Amino acid sequence: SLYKKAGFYTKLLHDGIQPVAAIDSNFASFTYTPRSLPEDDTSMAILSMLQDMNFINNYKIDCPTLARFCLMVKKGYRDPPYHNWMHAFSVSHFCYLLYKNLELTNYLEDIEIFALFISCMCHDLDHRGTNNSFQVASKSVLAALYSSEGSVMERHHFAQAIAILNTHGCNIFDHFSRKDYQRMLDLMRDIILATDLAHHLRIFKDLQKMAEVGYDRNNKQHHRLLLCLLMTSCDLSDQTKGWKTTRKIAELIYKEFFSQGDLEKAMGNRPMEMMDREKAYIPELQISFMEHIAMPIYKLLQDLFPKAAELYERVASNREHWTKVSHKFTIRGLPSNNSLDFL
Amino acid sequence: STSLYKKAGFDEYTKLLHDGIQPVAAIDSNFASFTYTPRSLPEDDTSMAILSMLQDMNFINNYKIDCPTLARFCLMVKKGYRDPPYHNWMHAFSVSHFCYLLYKNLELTNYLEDIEIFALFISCMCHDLDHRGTNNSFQVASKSVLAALYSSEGSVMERHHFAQAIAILNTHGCNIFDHFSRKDYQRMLDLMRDIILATDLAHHLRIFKDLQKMAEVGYDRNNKQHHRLLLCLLMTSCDLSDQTKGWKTTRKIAELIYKEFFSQGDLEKAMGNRPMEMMDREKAYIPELQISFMEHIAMPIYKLLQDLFPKAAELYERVASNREHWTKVSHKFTIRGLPSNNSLDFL
Ligand SMILES: C[C@@H](c1ccc(C(F)(F)F)cc1)n1nc(CC(F)(F)F)c2c(=O)[nH]c(=O)[nH]c21
Ligand SMILES: C[C@@H](c1ccc(C(F)(F)F)cc1)n1nc(CC(F)(F)F)c2c(=O)[nH]c(=O)[nH]c21
Ligand SMILES: [Mg+2]
Ligand SMILES: [Mg+2]
Ligand SMILES: [Zn+2]
Ligand SMILES: [Zn+2]
16 A cells, blocks of 8 residues: 655657657547557657647647646656556546547637646546545545545645646746636636546536536536536546456556555454455446446536547446456456456 | 515725724724624724724734725625625624634634634625525525535535635725735635635534544644634634623524524425424524524534633633523513514513
């Protein structure tokens, strides 16, 4: 359960901004797997995506400040199996896919799309590989600061994002008007807080009604709800990839969750069944997660954007794959080597 | 028709700064005492009294606040309250005055940061902005625009009060803190959000055990959570401070509270719903409701305050004394709801 922080540029300045097709001919496709990109190329890909969406030119972002900000955000992640920089990078890449494939500019303002992308980059900053309930249980300084207001980790992720903006030479919004600077902070706060599953559960009925009635671009609340839905669709986007990606991400998720369970046991507390390597049956847990959490989010996305149909179909297909592979997975927890390759 | 409460305008200035800011002793020699009843000050003098309190606490000088901006901000906040019997500007003014009394009598500068005390006072002025004379449950039942915006997160009215405070700061010529650094401006917004949200009784009940733990172990001025808990406790003590005044005040405030609550109950009945017993003029027995409110909500707040600040003992004693007064009333009060003339002057 020990996950380290790497700390407390010239390559990016020389050729950090590349045409996205040079990264991969399939880079702007829903079939691209951003985890296939070497970690050392991810900062360049972030700048390339911001350039391709034209935010660097439109918002007059200083490229050296943007390169420093990207490197700070990357260094802001610890190394647990799942909640690491490669996860934030892949969530950011999905936001870019939504911009490139769906007609986002016809639903949201440019500033809202920009905040969604930056929020994707920052949304799990300084994650400890433990959930909100663990923060409360371990009586952590994060729980001491935020538990009374809800969403302990998410309030921390936003605080970490603000701390990077306040670091000398990293403020990518430095030249914005006081009104636009504040608008960015408010959007980042709302979007990052939307990543707490408890928040999604509380607003589900309202997202359901928005898709039922129809998206109204003149309704400010519809913009807020859509941003919440888009953010959760980016956070769960590993489930929209191929079966091999889904299988590997289950391995990473459960290695992280089971380490939390082991730590709770060492503290003399009984963990939730899903975090207990002695009780959890991964295929059943993943089928339930896909049915209750991921599939409804992508079905809502399909209802608002017809071009998103393939995402829901992929999630449903990955759910069916777990049922078919469960006959070969006869154990609780993970195998001795923590790998699901045998499936 | 008694549920219709108007806004004076939409979401007296030159006159407010003509003779300069008044020293508090010129307003009243008893202005900084726990025996002062701020509801006695004429409503037209309240904006000047707010500036006078900010000047006496040295916030205008220490933060170099622009006096015309502060005068406009004060007038916008005052105009931001509707006219229900209890949740009107005189309540926000009285709550702000109590904050000032805590500053003067409990020497808060030895427990909290200057910016925290400043945010507490501003939050007191703004904490019930645009109140409709209804509770949070009513917003959900009436399917209001406020419930549509905030019901999932709880504290519907309190999130609205904070939003209204922010809208005033965003009005041209009303941003009293726009010269603050980005870090300090954010600190002020976070403090105002937390302090206003602490006025939801459900929030107070959730943090109650932690407030008791803090009072038991002892306040630590180096502990950030202790500062946050203390701000919540002080805000709740300001919000219920009418109970620390004389019996005449407690009796009048019961009249105002129940006129407001019963109008909500009548409105719920007109909507085909059965309201809470405390809001139903046909079921409510005011002396017992007030004894319960005092014993289970108000007295524990002033007891925690006394535990943390010995000089606050007189506040707890006064609240306990007003509770004993309701026990005396319960043996000479034979009606449900309020009398037909809506007056408790028969007491
Ligand atoms: C951290 C958590 C989680 C984060 C965020 C949201 C929200 F944004 F929707 F609220 C929900 C859930 N999470 N993430 C995955 C991986 C992913 F599916 F994303 F590929 C999984 C998973 O496979 N099984 C789980 O029981 N929880 C999982
Ligand atoms: C609006 C409510 C109320 C506000 C705020 C808080 C918290 F901040 F503590 F949470 C609790 C309770 N409230 N206010 C009073 C008047 C006062 F006592 F303040 F003089 C009363 C009352 O006499 N009886 C009640 O049943 N509820 C009352
Ligand atoms: Mg998260
Ligand atoms: Mg209130
Ligand atoms: Zn995430
Ligand atoms: Zn109040």
